[PDB]
Amino acid sequence: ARVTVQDAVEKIGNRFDLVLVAARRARQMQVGGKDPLVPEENDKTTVIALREIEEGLINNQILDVRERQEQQEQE
């Protein structure tokens, strides 16, 4: 995800949807201070979220149902 975001593009299916999903994940890492599921190896949150999509943990519907799970566990 440092040099090329190609395999994350093939995992997502859309460049613009990849930007939107990684933006929400990076906002959750910058604002809320959530736990990154990958080793950060002293990278920035943009590359960490892109590496999470590169592995395949972060998707639009997966992050939405996870956010829904945290919201329903808040209530």
Binding site: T4, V5, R15, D17, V19, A26, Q30, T46
Partner: protein
């Protein structure tokens, strides 16, 4: 703050008084003792808000504790000072004056509403002549412009019944007394009795104007300004200078003029002034108000103090330095740098070297954030001073911040979309931005003093755009054509050519090696050169059916340099990639093959490694230029002496007086062209194969290792024309008058020119340098016009499910193949199947993206023409679907929905503007008596199809041309089959027998004369413009009959065998002779960038081609006039159509045959409007695409046809209606074609008749102005006309364009913002 629409309309005086906060009643702005603003002035605090934050003028209320109050001492409302640029005033004008926009912007709208001439309205406004409003008597009607003498007559005559006023108040009273619905109804009745052309157009213009007023709800009295509003005093600011003197805006001067003349008019109306003085003052106020609204419009422009015309409001908004194009579209931008660019070849593909000081200045608030986070600075002031002192902990924090934070490298002029790329920056010590050498083919940047801008994305969304969309490892392929633009350029190319070339017996020839590593070991040890022909063992990896890689290992006859590059070439490519001498086209094919096989990441590392090895081995080469390397051919002086002797021989023949001067001139040019070609060929021979001193077989020959030939053959820098000017002959240089000079520049750039040859060369050098500047300006103007047409086009749907398409045949005009089927169709989506047996019976289904494998199958089975879905035929409303467009050329797969096509298409078109067997089809013929076949049709094409089924060439034969070969005959090459009379047009027949000379008498239709060579008489039919009174009603006919005299019929039809021949016919055939079938009877005689701009602006040319509007036979109906009318009646129904043709133009189609829909009646260039309206949408699309691509192939630039089809689809947006059904379209209103498609869909859903239409090809300027969005149109061009039409019609903007959301300030519906915009659209729909 979240608004759906920007509604524009006219402004009532009540609305202007509702905007304002206080009447401005004094011209003086501020004081001079203390600089506080005045009371009721142009800068007044009580009207325009307070000067300081939360403070009055006297100093009573001075804190936020008194949040909002009015000061009882000085009236200054205690608020923030931001409301000094949000509060307007108003001037109460004494005499109500007229708006200059809705009076002078043609059409005037006041002359078009009141139905009075503009000169008479201007005479009324200039107080020169009275106008009468109402009159009870029948002598004075409404709108009868009286003079002063006529009004003084009428005053003493009636004096009580009529009321006539003079000036703008009279026009206000006239617009008040008129009745909109009554005049609209009267003109609707007036339109129905008779319809002259000019009267119906004027009446429908007035009816459209009146219906616009009634449907918008405006009133016609609102065009007369009674209350004039005032701009806020921080939008017409008062800025000082450095020496105490003030430099105000010109708006303050114009407002001072209006206020002073209005106050003087109030004083003159109170002082009971004479009529002449008060009329002149009313005229001065009108002139001052019109100057403030538009200075240069009404008369002489009011100049300021420094003899320059002042800037009004219309000059602030409209123009090149207006508000729109200087601040709304393109703004200045913070967090931005600029420096010179140098070369960094130690970098990777996605890196650039920012300097330390410049990036410290760029990333300064980020350094503030990390300093306060790490606890090294308590406050923002301490962090500011720690950065300003440039400490070592600040440099370490900057090294941590700039890591993995991409910046955009922009370089102006950004022609295409690769002029902005995002790079991960690497901090270097210096002052120059170190680019990668590969991206300077995309940037079009050489290092001769260039400068690049560095913009820093701030937010996380912006960093992700720069990381996923705009990273320099992502856009390798160019978006114009699907070829890689990250390509080795000139230095890597010279190095790789010197590597993979081979000598004959260089060093260590004929060994056997254990592989690529031992070959590299041999070269770097020095026992073998780079050019030794050696046998190596190569283990190449082929690709399996799935993603696995099988291997093969054998011995190949290679060189050492190719066996060094096999360490670089990744696993997956064959050895035929590497095993030739690599020019620039060869390395382009290498990167393209590596892309299509492996993907992106092996392609990125292959480009970096091939650049490293190219640079390293070009350094180890030492490829130098010298004066012994530009080898002059040793037979140059002999050819030059022979050419000068031959030119002198023709010169003395002309001086003797045999050959004329023009033929001498043409002969001298042809001789010097042949001499220049011979010298250039001898030079190219002696430079290509001069290396002949060889050994180890015998004296052998090979290509030369000369460096000039090396950097020419590699495609690195230059071409054979440049090598010809260096070593051979300079050639024929042209004068600035276009004519080629007779004597050429014989010397080259090695022997040195003399004085006169250099002075001749300066003509073409300065002409080329002058031409280059002009084309760039033209290309940028063309690019702006193309972008502002194709703004509103984005992908919306995934598939529309249409069955239309454009059948892509390879363009086969002339003697060669211009574009193959691979370049024509690779990328698009097949509409129908491919129904041909062939050899393997390929059957691709519909909705299939044509990959390279499918195109390879099409090449193997040799398909002639395939029908694929185009952008023009797409059936999606407000945007196209992905399946009609096809392949995203920058990526290499299908196009994602939501990506803006039209901006990429317009950029790709307007970027190279700074560089600019016998087969018979459509026949009707008859076999003659000798077998020399003649054709009786004009539209006959002679197709040349090979034995496999594919087409080789194409030729169009004339009507009446002779032909020796029939269908199915396979003739060899070089045989001249095209035999035709070029100057004469025959009138040939298809039956035999005798001729009856009927309806021609010597004296009134034919001229009795003889031929001067044979003595036989010849009967030339006299033209009707010089005939006598007896020939004004007859048409002479060659009445062909049988052998005894009965009227023979045409076989198949019922028309008698007659031939109405036209005039000027050389009739050699007389009566009483035998006539065969098919023989003749008589002889009847006959830039790049401006062409692109005239095709796209859709200009009717200087001599249009007359076409047939209805299918059927053609006959003449009108006599005794030279304007030849054609009564082209159909063969089934009656004729409602005629056509007017001028005198001197000739005709191709005679009055005895039958033409189809869209036949060429008069030859010449055919206009694209009638091409569309007669042939069809696909035909005009194919015409525009072929004639644009002819220009772009003449100059040598590859551009895919889908971009030109996008511009054509954006040009065809309008559709006038010829007959309505039940929809809300009355007659001839040019509505958008998407609107009538939606209306027809709704009408055929609920079961009604529907409304037909007819499209019309608008130009680029007219389409972008007749775009339904007044903000997009006024940002493009003609801001005065667009805002006037929108204000009168009461239009609104729905905010659906990319340019609109750039101006407003939202996310554009293009790419990432498409999801947000469709969510907002469904939120508005569901609620």
């Amino acid at each position: 703050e979240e608004f759906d629409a920007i509604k524009i309309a006219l402004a009532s005086p009540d609305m202007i008084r509702s905007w304002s906060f206080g009447e401005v009643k004094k011209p003086e702005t501020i004081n001079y003792r203390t600089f506080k603003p005045e009371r009721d002035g142009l800068f007044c605090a009580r009207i325009f808000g307070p000067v300081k934050d939360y403070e009055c003028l006297c100093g009573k209320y001075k804190r936020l504790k008194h949040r909002g109050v009015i000061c009882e001492k000085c009236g200054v409302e205690v608020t923030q000072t931001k409301v000094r640029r949000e509060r307007m005033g108003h001037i109460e004008l004494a005499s109500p004056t007229a708006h200059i926009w809705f009076l002078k912007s043609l059409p005037s709208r006041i002359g078009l509403l009141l139905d009075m001439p503009l000169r008479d309205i201007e005479r009324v406004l200039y107080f020169e002549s009275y106008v009468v409003i109402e009159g009870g008597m029948t002598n004075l009607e409404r709108q009868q412009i009286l003079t002063e003498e006529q009004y003084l007559d009428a005053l003493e005559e009636f004096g009580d019944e009529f009321d006539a006023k003079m000036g703008a108040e009279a026009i206000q009273a006239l617009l008040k007394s008129m009745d909109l619905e009554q005049e609209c109804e009267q003109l609707r009745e007036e339109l129905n009795e008779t319809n002259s052309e000019t009267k119906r157009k004027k009446l429908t213009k007035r009816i459209k104007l009146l219906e616009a007023f009634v449907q918008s709800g405006n009133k016609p009295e609102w065009m007369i300004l009674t209350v004039l509003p005032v701009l806020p005093p921080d939008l017409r600011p008062l800025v000082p200078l450095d020496g105490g003197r003030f430099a105000t805006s010109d708006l303050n001067d114009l407002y001072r003029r209006v206020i002073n003349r209005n106050n003087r008019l109030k004083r003159l109306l109170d002082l009971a002034a004479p009529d002449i003085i008060v009329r002149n003052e009313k005229r001065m106020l009108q002139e001052a108000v019109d100057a403030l609204l538009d200075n240069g419009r009404r008369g002489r422009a009011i100049t300021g103090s420094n003899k320059r015309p002042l800037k009004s409001l219309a000059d602030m908004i409209k123009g090149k330095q207006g508000r729109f194009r200087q601040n709304l579209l393109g703004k200045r931008v913070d967090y931005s740098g600029r420096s010179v660019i140098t070369v960094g070849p130690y970098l990777r593909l996605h890196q650039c070297g920012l300097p330390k000081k410049m990036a410290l200045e760029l990333f300064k608030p980020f350094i503030y954030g990390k300093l306060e986070l790490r606890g090294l600075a308590t406050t923002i002031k301490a962090a500011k001073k720690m950065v300003e002192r440039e400490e070592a902990v600040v440099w370490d924090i900057l090294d941590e911040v700039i890591r993995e934070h991409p910046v955009l490298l922009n370089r102006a002029p950004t022609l295409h979309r690769l002029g902005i790329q995002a790079f991960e920056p690497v901090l270097i010590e210096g002052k120059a931005i170190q680019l990668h050498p590969l991206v300077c083919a995309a940037y079009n940047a050489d290092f001769d003093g260039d400068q690049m801008a560095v913009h820093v994305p701030l937010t996380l969304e912006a960093q992700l755009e720069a990381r996923a969309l705009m990273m320099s490892t992502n856009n390798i392929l160019s978006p114009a054509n699907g070829e890689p633009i990250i390509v080795p350029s000139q230095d890597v190319v010279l190095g790789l050519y010197y590597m993979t070339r081979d000598c004959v017996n260089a060093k260590g020839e004929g060994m056997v090696l254990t592989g690529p590593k031992e070959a590299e070991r041999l070269y770097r040890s020095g026992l073998a050169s780079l050019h030794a022909r050696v046998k190596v063992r190569i283990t190449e990896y082929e690709k399996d059916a799935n993603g696995e890689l099988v291997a093969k290992t054998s011995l190949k006859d290679t060189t050492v340099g190719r066996a060094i590059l096999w360490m670089i070439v990744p696993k997956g490519l064959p050895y035929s990639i590497v095993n030739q001498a690599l020019g620039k086209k060869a390395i382009s094919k290498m990167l393209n093959t590596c892309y299509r096989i492996l993907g992106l990441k092996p392609t990125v590392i292959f480009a970096d490694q091939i650049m490293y090895t190219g640079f390293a081995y070009a350094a180890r080469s030492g490829a130098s230029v010298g004066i012994d390397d530009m080898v002059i051919p040793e037979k140059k002086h002999e050819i030059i002496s022979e050419a000068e002797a031959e030119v002198a021989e023709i010169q003395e023949q002309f001086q003797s007086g045999l050959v004329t001067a023009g033929e001498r001139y043409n002969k001298v040019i042809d001789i010097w062209a042949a001499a220049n070609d011979r010298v250039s060929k001898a030079m190219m021979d002696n430079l290509q194969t001069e290396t002949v001193i060889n050994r180890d077989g015998q004296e052998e020959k090979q290509v030369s290792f000369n460096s000039i030939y090396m950097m020419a053959d590699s495609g690195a820098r230059g071409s054979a024309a440049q090598i010809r000017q260096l070593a051979g002959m300079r050639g024929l240089m042209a004068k600035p008058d276009g004519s080629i000079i007779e004597t050429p520049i014989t010397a080259n750039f090695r022997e040195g020119l003399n004085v006169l040859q250099y002075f001749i060369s300066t003509h073409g050098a300065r002409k080329g340098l002058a031409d280059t500047a002009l084309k760039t300006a033209n290309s940028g103007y063309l690019t702006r016009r193309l972008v502002d047409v194709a703004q509103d086009l984005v992908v919306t749907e995934d598939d529309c499910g249409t069955h239309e398409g454009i059948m892509m045949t390879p363009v086969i005009e002339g003697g060669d193949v211009k574009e193959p089927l691979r370049d024509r169709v690779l990328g698009r989506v097949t509409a129908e199947d491919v129904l041909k047996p062939g050899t393997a019976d390929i059957l691709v289904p519909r909705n299939t993206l044509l990959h390279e494998q499918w195109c390879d199958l099409l090449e193997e089975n040799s398909v002639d023409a395939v029908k694929v879905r185009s952008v023009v035929s797409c059936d999606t409303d407000f945007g196209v679907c992905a399946h009609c467009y096809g392949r995203d050329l920058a990526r290499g797969h299908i196009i994602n929905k939501g990506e803006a096509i039209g901006v990429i298409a317009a950029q790709s078109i307007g970027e190279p503007g700074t560089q600019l067997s016998i087969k018979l089809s459509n026949v009707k013929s008859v076999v003659n008596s000798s077998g020399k076949l003649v054709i009786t049709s004009r539209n006959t094409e002679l197709k040349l199809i090979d034995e496999f089924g594919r087409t080789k060439e194409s030729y169009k034969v004339p009507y009446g041309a002779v032909l020796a070969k029939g269908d199915g005959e396979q003739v060899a090459g070089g045989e001249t089959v095209a035999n035709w009379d070029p100057h004469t047009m025959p009138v040939i027949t298809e039956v035999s027998g005798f001729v009856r000379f009927t309806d021609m008498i010597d004296g009134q239709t034919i001229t009795r004369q003889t031929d001067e060579l044979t003595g036989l008489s010849s009967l030339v039919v006299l033209d009707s413009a010089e005939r006598t009174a007896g020939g004004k009603d007859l048409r002479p006919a060659l009445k062909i009959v049988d052998a005894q005299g009965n009227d023979v019929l045409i076989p198949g039809t019922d028309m008698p065998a007659q031939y109405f021949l036209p005039g000027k016919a050389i009739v050699q055939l007389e009566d009483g002779v035998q006539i065969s079938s098919g023989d003749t009877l008589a002889r009847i005689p006959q830039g790049g960038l401006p062409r692109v701009a005239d095709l796209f602006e859709a200009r009717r040319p200087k001599e249009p081609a007359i076409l047939a509007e209805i299918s059927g036979i053609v006959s003449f109906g009108k006599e005794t006039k030279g304007k030849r009318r054609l009564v082209i009646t159909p063969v089934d129904g009656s004729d409602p159509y005629e056509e007017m043709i001028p005198k001197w133009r000739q005709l191709n189609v005679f009055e005895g045959e039958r033409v189809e829909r869209g036949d060429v009646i008069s030859d010449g260039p055919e206009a694209p409007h009638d091409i569309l309206r007669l042939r069809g949408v696909h035909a005009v699309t194919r015409y525009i695409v072929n004639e644009v691509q002819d220009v772009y192939r003449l100059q040598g630039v590859k551009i895919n046809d889908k971009h030109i089809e996008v511009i054509v689809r954006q040009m065809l947006r309008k559709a006038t209606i010829v007959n309505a059904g039940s929809s809300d379209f009355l007659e001839g209103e040019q509505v958008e074609y998407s609107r009538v498609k939606i209306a027809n869909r709704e009408l055929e859903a609920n079961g009604k008749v529907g409304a037909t239409y007819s499209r019309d090809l608008l130009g680029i300027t007219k389409a972008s102005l007749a775009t339904e969005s007044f903000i997009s149109a006024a940002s493009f061009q003609e801001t005065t006309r667009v805002l006037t039409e929108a204000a009168v019609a009461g239009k609104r903007d729905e905010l659906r364009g990319l340019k609109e959301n750039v101006i407003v300030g939202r996310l554009i519906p293009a790419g990432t913002g498409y999801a947000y915009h469709q969510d907002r659209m469904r939120r508005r729909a569901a609620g």
